[model samples]
Target: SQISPIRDVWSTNLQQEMNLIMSLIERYPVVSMDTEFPGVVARPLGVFKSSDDYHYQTLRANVDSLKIIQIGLALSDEEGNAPVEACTWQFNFTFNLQDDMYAPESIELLTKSGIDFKKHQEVGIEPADFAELLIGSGLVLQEEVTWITFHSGYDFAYLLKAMTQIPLPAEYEEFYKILCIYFPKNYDIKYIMKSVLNNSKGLQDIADDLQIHRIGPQHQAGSDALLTARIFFEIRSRYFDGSIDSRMLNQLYGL
Candidate 1:
């Protein structure tokens, strides 16, 4: 029997593990990503002409005001094959529990999902440090790697901030431009499901519809990412006649 390998990276082993991922990235270029945050506490004030504007305004506020808790990367190939040894990596980030903007219900949900706030606060890797590794990891600005996510507006936003060490861009257009520059290819599973599956709304729901089971806990970044990659391949096999769809490339959801 085989097992899923998920590595949790702290500051001590951050550089070494990140380098390992970078070295293997060229072969496994499809990077499935998921992020964990405290939760959204901000609201938009202005009217929206389009859904993209509304989504971007809300995303900008959350990324600007809230602190990121974790980021998970599950590296896979174009054909959805993760490396045999270790393919999933999740990094916990420092967040100020006392001061960061978060909804109590959200925090409670995350707490149920196995996040230890006290430990993260004391020993988590800094966002700037993580961003430093990310910028130099060659994954950013490389058109070769494809980023996969499910309903991932805030996922990419938090990631963009971690990669840039600054607040999100003021304009959603600027935000989109930066994402296009940093990550050239994005495949959103939720968007595709709307077109293809029409079966479920959440990631877990889709997994269930496809009969996919988890070896790890729900709401944890690494396992969710792993499941996302698996579900993508399954859908591709069943719906796209076993090939990537031409229409789904760079299809940003929540936009």
Candidate 2:
């Protein structure tokens, strides 16, 4: 138990909770995000000029083939100020193992994290509805808000697919271009930490190293996002006291 509540938004409460996120995020626009999805099943046999493009191509294969299972959103301000009532949300989406493509390993990992697939299958929000709510809320495609993520190449890929309902662009630059426009301002904690620590670690490892407390469960989106927010706040405080460098912004790890 963190001070702020981790709200779960199923189909029953999806609309109302989305409105809440919209209103709160407009006030505290820096959102720390996390997502859970199936594991990557395909490798890039395609051409690659560099390792980065190859990684992106692999991301295109996995994300275009699979779908988002859950999304975690935590709202905070420049100084890490969160709303007192509730600051985090976990939105679950419908997925079918028989009908949809998924990596068993990834699904099992999420299952071990206490994801109730039965509940999700029976009563979860549709991707289209979630995208509609998110887009209508001005959460995505708005330059004013800043997004924080952890090794989020695939995270953004699945999310962008869900929102656009289209395959990832063939060219990696086009993928970056779409993100550059929709998410104009962004921060990837993992990438930034590579400079500060001189070696980056996994999200949980960094949190533990920094002595940050995680209130909720691991692998699950809600708790993960909250942990990310706290770690980001700590890193900024310990490193950058004044204006943050432009180079640090809009950078995602594993991209």
Candidate 3:
């Protein structure tokens, strides 16, 4: 399953957001997971806000300069337990097209390869190649259902549909429904991490730990996605026990 981000603020600070994500993964000891794109605001013609919304400004300024290069994941054991003991996949992999380094010419090549470069033109990339790379990476190991949790189910759904031209796979349908039922109600992945772990740091914390500049040209897709996966497990360890049954899992899956 693919897990997505659950937003804590309206305009999420990617750095801060990532920090909170890392803390959660460490505490949970479960594998972390995430998918990224440019920014939610597809255009620069929006309201002017304070520094708090700087992610938007930063993204707008470099909108076409970057792209979502990777989707990171930390898979749990087949049982789907928190504090996951055994890791089926032992290493973190960065999935990317060999041509991404080619600049605009690569973009044209990608678009011609049946990837939707037009939709991602503002961000100078497409989700199709990214998704294809993910599928080819063979990182996901288990036959069990995969989780693709995100901040907004519809946004994630649309992104995949826009790129892959198919709904999220059936294995994830139940999990998606579970997210819809619970998210933004009794608890959220971010808030759960903050409260259970008593560590309120966000994505910025993750960058600091990795010693990576949170912004700029080299803030490549794989880097951000890896950080996202790390934070995911930290939070799970704090709130959940190692074992989860179908009933409890279902209950927690939704609100």
Best by TM-score: 2
For residues 91-153, write the lDDT of model 1, one tens digit per residue.
988867787779888889989999889978888889899898898897888888888898888
lDDT of 1: 0.84
Q: Give candidate 1 misplaced runs (Cα > 4 Å).
A: 1-4, 195-200
Per-residue lDDT of model 2, residues 17-59, tens digit only: 9888877877898889999988888797857888888888888
Residue lDDT tens for model 3, 1-255:
334222221112323433443444433333334434333433345665554244334333332333443333433433333333212111111223443332455445434433343323333324553344433333222223334232323223433443444434433444345334322121233334343435555555744654534321122223333344444444344346533223223222111
* Cα lDDT, model 2, residue 91: 93
Q: What is the lDDT of residue 228 in candidate 3?
A: 42
| Cα error of candidate 3 at position 174, Å | 12
lDDT of the candidates, in the order given? 0.84, 0.85, 0.35
TM-score, per-candidate, Cα-based: 0.94, 0.94, 0.36
Q: What lDDT, from 0 to 1, does candidate 3 have?
A: 0.35
lDDT of 3 at 45: 51
Model 2: lDDT to the true structure: 0.85
Residue 76 displacement (Å), model 3: 5.9
Clashing pairs in 1: none
